[PDB]
Ligand SMILES: Cc1ccc(C2CC2)c(-c2ccc3c(c2)CCCO3)c1[C@H](OC(C)(C)C)C(=O)O
Ligand SMILES: Cc1ccc(C2CC2)c(-c2ccc3c(c2)CCCO3)c1[C@H](OC(C)(C)C)C(=O)O
Ligand SMILES: [Cl-]
Ligand SMILES: [Mg+2]
């Protein structure tokens with residue numbers, strides 16, 4: 584699955600649930616709150632190593 | 634277990650040495666990192682995970698080891714983190730070898746890697762031979 | 776071939792220097808982004824590599840960093856024989872290909888480099904390169 | 917146990933040179949066909965530790 588880390592405050596928050604990866608913004612959910620974050624403030628990470 | 638590592642930082646000459654030990658063998662890798670931060674720790678872990686089958690890393694509660702960038706690296710690479718004496722014993726041993734060889738190199742980091750080599754190659758098996766044997770056995774027997 | 780034989784070469788992306796080492800018999804690789812393509816950076820890379828693996832021979836082209844005095848010193852101290860003059864060049868291309876596949880997942884080029892190293896070393900044909908180097912070296916003990 | 921000497925004159929390092937003699941303040945070395953006296957601080961005497 585995916586986890587999204589994101590910024591607002593320079594500390595990276597998350598993991599949040601990924602909902603949509605847009606060109607300029609990312610839609611996520613973090614603790615039941617829906618958030619829209621700019622692409623540059625989001626880090627979308629897979630569990631590649633399982 | 635073949636997949637268990639301990640990581641910790643130690644200091645010499647105002648510089649930060651990040652040390653990884655393969656607990657079952659005593660094998661070590663180390664880097665002088667420019668700052669004792671989560672970002673530098675996370676990059677080190679990604680390199681380590683590409684070389685060996687890193688399944689669990691044990692650390693103390695230093696803020697670099699509990700940082701979000703390290704959690705991200707561990708999630709990507711499939712590493713489980715556990716928190717809270719092998720590496721602390723290993724810190725002292727490495728500093729001892731470093732002090733024995735320090736005047737042979739200009740840079741502290743050169744002495745650090747000389748000491749790592751010396752530690753890993755010393756024999757009737759060395760730590761470098763033991764980690765390769767432990768991991769290959771796990772593979773060769775499913 | 777010999778379990779002790781490695782090839783090293785530099786490649787370049789985004790204006791940065793990537794130093795790559797390949798264990799010829801397994802395909803296993805290690806890489807680092809170095810700040811300058813110098814003998815001193817190459818020598819330091821070799822000291823680290825020699826501490827991890829039984830490095831007996833390193834094969835390179837005649838790039839001035841590989842023929843430098845500092846690298847000679849490192850190889851002398853570590854017990855490494857140097858030979859000069861297509862495995863690593865094939866590996867450079869494959870590494871650059873994986874980097875491109877994952878590049879937008881990391882801010883820093885060096886982060887994507889290490890992700891690509893991990894991907895290459897862990898992929899099974901049916902052993903992975905990371906399994907073959909450990910299998911080859913343990914058997915040769 | 918074998919030794920080679922690397923040294924400066926020019927900030928580029930030279931060598932390997934054969935170690936002829938080590939004194940308290942200088943090393944005497946032979947780089948190809950020239951014998952040189954080099955201050956200790958400008959020389960690195962390196963053993964083939966890996967062996
Ligand atoms: C800074 C420097 C300059 C010159 C040398 C060699 C004389 C040729 C070495 C060197 C090169 C290799 C070497 C040792 C020393 C000592 C024994 C182990 O192998 C180093 C070295 O710095 C690096 C970054 C490694 C180049 C250092 O810190 O003195
Ligand atoms: C610069 C930066 C910031 C934040 C992160 C994480 C969101 C918390 C990562 C990161 C951390 C771990 C990680 C990946 C990315 C991508 C997948 C592999 O694991 C990186 C990262 O820089 C390093 C130097 C590695 C910290 C980068 O260049 O984006
Ligand atoms: Cl003298
Ligand atoms: Mg600590």
Ligand SMILES: [Mg+2]
Nearest residue numbers: 784785836838
């Ligand atoms: Mg080249």
